[PDB]
Paper text:
Here, by studying CRLs in the SKP1–[name]–F-box ([name]) family, we show how neddylated [name] ligases and [name] (an [name]-type E3 ligase) co-evolved to ubiquitylate diverse substrates presented on various F-box proteins. Notably, numerous cellular neddylated SCFs and some other CRLs have been reported to associate with [name], an E3, to form ‘E3–E3’ ligases in which [name] serves as the ubiquitin-carrying enzyme. We developed activity-based chemical probes that enabled cryo-electron microscopy visualization of steps in E3–E3 ubiquitylation, initiating with ubiquitin linked to the E2 enzyme [name], then transferred to the catalytic cysteine of [name], and culminating in ubiquitin linkage to a substrate bound to the [name] E3 ligase.
To visualize the TS1 reaction (ubiquitin transfer from [name] to [name]), we installed an electrophile between the catalytic cysteine of [name] and the penultimate glycine of ubiquitin that captures the catalytic cysteine of [name] depending on native reaction requirements. A 3.6 Å-resolution reconstruction largely resembles the pre-TS1 intermediate, but also shows the catalytic Rcat domain of [name] and the preceding helix gripping the [name]-linked ubiquitin. To capture ubiquitin in the TS1 reaction, the catalytic cysteine of [name] is relocated approximately 60 Å from its position in autoinhibited [name]. However, in the E3–E3 platform, the WHB domain of [name] and [name] pack against each other, and the Ile44 patch of [name] engages the UBAL subdomain of [name]. Compared to autoinhibited ARIH134,43,49, the straightening of the RTI helix and rotation of the UBAL domain towards [name] accommodates canonical [name] catalytic presentation of the [name]~ubiquitin conjugate. In the TS1 intermediate, the linker that connects the [name] IBR and Rcat domains—which is displaced by the switch-helix conformational change—is remodelled into a Ub-guided helix that synergizes with the Rcat domain to promote its capturing of the [name]-linked ubiquitin. The Ub-guided helix is rotated nearly 180° to bind the Ile44-centred hydrophobic patch of ubiquitin. The Ub-guided helix thus projects the ensuing Rcat domain towards ubiquitin. Catalytically important residues of the Rcat domain grip the extended C-terminal tail of ubiquitin in a β-sheet, which culminates in linkage between ubiquitin and [name].
Residue numbers in the entry:
A (entry chain U): 1 to 75
B (entry chain N): 1 to 76
C (entry chain R): 21 to 59, 67 to 108
D (entry chain D): 1 to 151
E (entry chain C): 336 to 686, 705 to 776
F (entry chain H): 98 to 164, 184 to 390, 406 to 554
The structure:
């Protein structure tokens, strides 16, 4: 049960996560690993955006899969 | 008396000086082995840039001490 | 005085060309071409003083009728032996 | 809790000092982390008419910025009808944990007097304001006149 | 019982050649013989006792590969390409024509053994380079044991590595065959041309196959010119377009020196012929006067003059000079020694900071002339650094590119090669 | 050559104090000041040297930000409970600890941490940060953040793209030359992809964005995100000011979202920002070949396994070990040839048809066909007990394939040198 996150600086990293976990907790894990505050991140998988409502299993996140990270500058 | 000048990468230079030898003369003595005209060369000692017209003994240098050498590609 | 009775010399044979690539198969001009190599392979000369293997230039002229270094018309000028 | 200890002394200082631009410092003495206040401008057309502001101090104060909410409506190029202002003195990129809230007050009031048509969240309104300034001094005047408060 | 045998046989063979040490590193015979002995002994061991199961033969082969590729001889000369070189040298030293005549049976047997030691090595291209070089030498100099032996060795190499491996050697051999054929036709066509005074013979090679370079700037004497031109015109007749680039640096003949007192008969190279034929008229030429007429290069002329002066045919102005080491100047006489005498006849008279300097010059000339062309810049930087060193043109281009990406210059907009001063 | 190196986090952290010592040898300032100044110059020694020694200092120091109750908690404390930077402001260590902790644990700002008091901008060194906080995990987080900043800001270092390799490839100067970093991966140091021998980096990017059969997130990224002009990170906007400020680690550069230009003039006084039939067929052909080769290069484990299994099985039927050795070598060459043909197709896409392109697209078809025949030989025709011909066939085939691919690479590189292609 591991997935891959492609960071802004290349540096692909791997996450340990359970299929019942939510995107907010995923963001918290990414924040702990790298340092990006978990509120200007967007995670993109399979060409569709990842909101905060549903979960990885809902989004049909497989195992040993990659999902990208982009910034969410506002204001 | 024998002093040395260190380049930025780390290569070492041996030069003998006379008390009345001038900074420009030292630049030439550098160039006879480094091929760098004195406009590009700069000489560094005690954090202060070595003035062009001065004498090696003015700074009260004693031999052995390194007068660190730095390049400058503009050099006026 | 005369001091000459015998002589044995060594000479290298080579095609009478100025550059050596054949510019079609990119092989050395003296070697075999790209089809005779995957197994009587002479050189042909062009009226513009260009030379290639015979088999390479044959296929090239079979498809397009242009000398492939100078996009001009092509006609045979001297074979090789 | 340190938020409360700081805010009580800051509020006491503001009240004791007295100001010519801030009136009606209304605050719930129990929660004490929310402020309701009335500001009054001087420059037209916003001078005609009073209007109110609500401040929400977050839990982690003064180590996080106090978000400000602009309750009463107003016709300003740099203010949303929902009541959101940008005010770079507060954005999380520059909030320094020593600035007294009155400095925020003067910064906001200076924003009110002087518009910024180059950082707009009402794009068409700001473009028109930067185009034909003369009429909007009346256009916003009616809106404030019918939607301000008693000063 | 497999994994253990491999460890024993590899360990045993390694120290067998360690004993010879440096004595092998210059004598391939002992090295190849030792490897062969170890292999033969343990092949005989696993041939009968172990019934020749696949695993044991696999162990033998793996260990032989291991201890042939790296061992003491490899380490002492510090590379892995010292075993194939030694094998090639052994094969050459076996196929040369020595005083001893090789018996066909034992020759074939020994070549069969060399094939084994070859099939174990792991870099079969260095071996081809060295074998090609040595075969070229001993074919050109007519110094070979048996043409059947040469053909057999090439045939088994082809069997063990394929038609592409041994194409150069096959061409290199058929060339000597065609040369032998063509010389007879020249002799036949020669019945009607009356060759001036000499017995002529030539060996006409190919170009891509043999490892030889063009020539060494020689000016032919007038003695051989008739034969040279007649053969070149004959060759141009039988073929359409073909260009003989004669190379005299490796070619030999025979003199008769019918000027001394006892009718000797010399035997030397073409450079010797040029020099000695020069002295047909007079005997008071110097090094400069010689290079005026023979056009030979200074170093080769010095070598040839020294080798002649080692013999008593030519003598300096001094009589007891140690001609082996004394080097001479362009204004130095050479005297023909008229009284030379040899005890016999038929003599055989033969044998970075630099990058930083690049960048400094680049920026200096740039600020001197802001706008200027690439090739002219190359010339100017070469002039500025001539007293120091001549950096390679790729190195200068590289430093130019590094300085471009370091923001001290940028190629002008729209042109591939034109540099403007970064401001 | 291409001199490079591999390190880990601890060595890449210690090399920082190494560089600090190197520069401070001649600067003669305390370590904190040197670190600040150098970090402002993207860790380039000579730039700092020339900008420090070109004239005045105080302008640089202002350009680098270096030069009774508490005002934060409003409580009284002993004079032993007040500390502050060299700017003059004085606070207490409880507020210091909480401020630094919240900053570096909830904002990620590791290196650019400024003085708390209003209006000040004197940033905080390393020693003070270590001297105030007390937790250990916070300290290690700070170390990790500054190390990541050091790597990303520098242009001689690069994290390995492998999903878990923790290694930086320190090199002397970047030229898109492949390197390997001991985790088993080799990549193009300049673009981060796998090594691509003939094709240039930019065409590889343009082709890999729309690879058209592997990923779709690139379409989203193009359709909804620009890139920061300064730090080059993909940014998605959902605000309204149009006055974007890059909230990266140390790219605090503010600009305009639409024109993507600097914001200082822009919006200041008066400036206002406001495939038919042949193409898809050509793309279809090239992408078909590229995807086929990608599939085959993905299944390379199965090819090794299957040839190994047939290798053993053929060995047990009274066949020795050296045969199956040549078989392994053949497989290796086959894989290399497919790997090169892959990027050769990419190169041959973006290429306008001229004379020197039909030559290339006629050579690569031949190498394609020979690769296919070799792969056809292996599977079936290694069947059984026909070694003496199949071995010859396979050796002849793979030497030919290797020679041809070397010719293709040389053709491409010569064309680049001679400016002979047109797109
Ligand atoms: Zn042919
Ligand atoms: Zn050809
Ligand atoms: Zn032509
Ligand atoms: Zn405090
Ligand atoms: Zn301060
Ligand atoms: Zn790696
Ligand atoms: Zn690349
Ligand atoms: Zn940026
Ligand atoms: Zn714009």
């Amino acid at each position: 049960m591991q997935i891959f996150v492609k960071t802004l600086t290349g540096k692909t990293i791997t996450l340990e996560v359970e299929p019942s976990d939510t995107i907010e907790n995923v963001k918290a894990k990414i924040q702990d690993k790298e340092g990006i505050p978990p509120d200007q991140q967007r995670l993109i998988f399979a060409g569709k955006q990842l909101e905060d409502g549903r979960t990885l299993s809902d989004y049909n996140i497989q195992k040993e899969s990659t999902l990208h990270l982009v910034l969410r500058l506002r204001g | 008396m024998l002093i040395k000048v260190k380049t930025l990468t780390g290569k070492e230079i041996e030069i003998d000086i006379e008390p009345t030898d001038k900074v420009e003369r030292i630049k030439e003595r550098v160039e006879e082995k480094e091929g760098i005209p004195p406009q590009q060369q700069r000489l560094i000692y005690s954090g202060k840039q070595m003035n062009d017209e001065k004498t090696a003994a003015d700074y009260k240098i004693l031999g052995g001490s390194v007068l660190h050498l730095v390049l400058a590609l503009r050099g006026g | 005085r005369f001091e000459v009775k015998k002589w044995n010399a060594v000479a290298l044979w080579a095609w009478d060309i100025v550059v050596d690539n054949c510019a079609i198969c990119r092989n050395h001009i003296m070697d075999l071409c790209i089809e005779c190599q995957a197994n009587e392979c002479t050189v042909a000369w062009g009226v513009c003083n260009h030379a290639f293997h015979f088999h390479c230039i044959s296929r090239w002229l079979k498809t397009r009728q242009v000398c492939p270094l100078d996009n001009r018309e092509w006609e045979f000028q001297k074979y090789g032996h | 809790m340190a938020a409360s200890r700081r805010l009580m002394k800051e509020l006491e200082e503001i009240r004791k000092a007295g100001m010519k631009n801030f009136r009606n410092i209304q605050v719930d003495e129990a929660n004490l982390l929310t402020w309701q206040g009335l500001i009054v401008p001087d420059n037209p057309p916003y001078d005609k008419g009073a209007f109110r502001i609500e401040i929400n101090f977050p839990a982690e104060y003064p180590f996080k910025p106090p978000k400000i909410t602009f309750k009463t409506k107003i016709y300003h190029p740099n203010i949303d009808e929902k009541g959101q202002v940008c005010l770079p003195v507060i954005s999380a990129e520059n909030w320094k944990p020593a600035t007294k809230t009155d400095q925020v007050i003067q910064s906001l009031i200076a924003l009110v007097n002087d518009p910024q048509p180059e950082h707009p969240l009402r794009a068409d309104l700001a473009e028109e304001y930067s185009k034909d300034r003369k009429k909007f001094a009346k256009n916003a005047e009616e809106f404030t006149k019918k939607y301000g408060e008693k000063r | 019982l497999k994994k253990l045998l491999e460890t024993h046989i590899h360990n045993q063979g390694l120290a067998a050649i360690e004993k010879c040490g440096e004595a092998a590193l210059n004598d391939p015979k002992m090295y190849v013989q030792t490897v062969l002995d170890v292999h033969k002994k343990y092949n005989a061991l696993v041939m009968s006792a172990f019934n020749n199961d696949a695993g044991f033969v696999a162990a033998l082969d793996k260990a032989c590969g291991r201890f042939i590729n790296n061992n003491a001889v490899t380490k002492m000369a510090q590379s892995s390409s010292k075993s194939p070189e030694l094998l090639a040298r052994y094969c050459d030293s076996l196929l040369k024509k020595s005083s001893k005549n090789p018996e066909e049976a034992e020759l074939e047997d020994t070549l069969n053994q060399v094939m084994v030691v070859f099939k174990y090595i792991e870099d079969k291209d260095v071996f081809q380079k060295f074998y090609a070089k040595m075969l070229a030498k001993r074919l050109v100099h007519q110094n070979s044991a048996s043409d059947d032996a040469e053909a057999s060795m090439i045939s088994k190499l082809k069997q063990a590595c394929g038609f592409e491996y041994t194409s150069k050697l096959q061409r290199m051999f058929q060339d000597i065959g065609v040369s032998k054929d063509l010389n007879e036709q020249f002799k036949k066509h020669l019945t009607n041309s009356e060759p001036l005074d000499l017995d002529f013979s030539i060996q006409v090679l190919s170009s891509g196959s043999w490892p030889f370079q063009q020539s060494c700037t020689f000016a032919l004497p007038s003695e051989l010119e008739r034969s040279y031109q007649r053969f070149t015109a004959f060759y141009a007749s039988r073929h359409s377009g073909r260009k003989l680039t004669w190379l005299y640096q490796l070619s030999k003949g025979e003199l008769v020196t019918n000027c001394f007192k006892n009718r000797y008969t010399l035997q030397a190279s073409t450079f010797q012929m040029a020099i000695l034929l020069q002295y047909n008229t007079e005997d008071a030429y110097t090094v400069q006067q010689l290079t005026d007429s023979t056009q030979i290069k200074m170093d080769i002329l010095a070598q040839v003059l020294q080798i002649l002066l080692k013999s008593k045919l030519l003598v300096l102005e001094d009589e007891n000079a140690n001609v082996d080491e004394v080097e001479l100047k362009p204004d130095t006489l050479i005297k023909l020694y008229l009284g030379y005498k040899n005890k016999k006849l038929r003599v055989n008279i033969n044998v970075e900071d630099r990058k930083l300097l690049i960048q400094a010059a680049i920026v200096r000339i740039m600020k001197m002339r802001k706008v200027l062309k690439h090739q002219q810049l190359l010339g100017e930087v070469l002039t500025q650094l001539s007293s120091r060193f001549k950096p390679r043109v790729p190195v200068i281009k590289k430093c130019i590119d590094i300085l471009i990406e370091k923001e001290y210059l940028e190629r002008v907009d729209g042109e591939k090669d034109t540099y403007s001063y970064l401001a | 050559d291409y001199r490079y190196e591999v390190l880990t986090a601890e060595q890449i952290l210690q090399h920082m104090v190494e560089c600090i010592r190197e520069v401070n040898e001649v600067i003669q300032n305390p370590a904190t000041i040197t670190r600040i100044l150098l970090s402002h110059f993207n860790w380039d020694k000579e730039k700092l040297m020339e900008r420090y020694f070109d004239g005045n200092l105080e302008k640089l120091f202002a350009e680098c930000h270096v030069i009774m109750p508490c005002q934060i908690c409003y409580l009284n404390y002993p004079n032993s409970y007040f500390t502050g930077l060299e700017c003059g402001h004085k606070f207490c260590m409880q507020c210091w600890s909480e401020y630094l902790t919240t900053k570096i644990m909830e904002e990620g700002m590791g290196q650019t941490i400024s003085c708390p008091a209003h209006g000040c901008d004197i940033l905080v060194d390393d020693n003070t940060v270590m001297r105030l906080i007390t937790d250990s995990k916070v300290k290690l987080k700070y170390q990790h953040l500054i190390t990541n900043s050091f790597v990303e800001c520098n242009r001689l270092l690069k994290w390995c793209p492998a999903p878990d390799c923790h290694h930086v490839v320190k090199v002397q100067y970047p030229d898109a030359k492949p390197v390997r970093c001991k985790c088993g991966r080799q990549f193009c140091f300049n673009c981060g992809e796998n090594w691509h021998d003939p094709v240039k980096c930019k065409w590889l990017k343009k082709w890999i964005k729309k690879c058209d059969d592997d990923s779709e997130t690139s379409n989203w990224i193009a359709a909804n995100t620009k890139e920061c002009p300064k730090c080059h990170v993909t940014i998605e906007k959902d605000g309204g000011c149009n006055h974007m400020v890059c909230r990266n680690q140390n790219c605090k550069a503010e600009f305009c979202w639409v024109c993507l230009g600097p914001w200082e003039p822009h919006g200041s006084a008066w400036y206002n920002c406001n495939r038919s039939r042949a193409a898809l067929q050509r793309y279809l052909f090239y992408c078909n070949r590229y995807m086929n080769h990608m599939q085959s290069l993905r299944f390379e484990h199965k090819l090794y396994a299957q040839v190994k299994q047939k290798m053993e099985e053929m060995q047990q039927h009274n066949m020795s070990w050296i045969e199956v050795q040549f078989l392994k070598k053949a497989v290796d060459v086959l894989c290399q040839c497919r790997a090169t043909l892959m990027y050769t197709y990419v190169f041959a896409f973006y290429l306008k048809k001229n004379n020197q392109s039909i030559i290339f697209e006629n050579n690569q078809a031949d190498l394609e066909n020979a690769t296919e025949v070799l792969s056809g030989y292996l599977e079936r025709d290694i069947s059984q007990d026909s070694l003496q011909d199949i071995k010859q066939k396979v050796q002849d085939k793979y030497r030919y394939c290797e020679s041809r691919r070397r010719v293709l690479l040389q053709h491409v590189h010569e064309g680049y040198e001679k400016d002979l292609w047109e797109y």
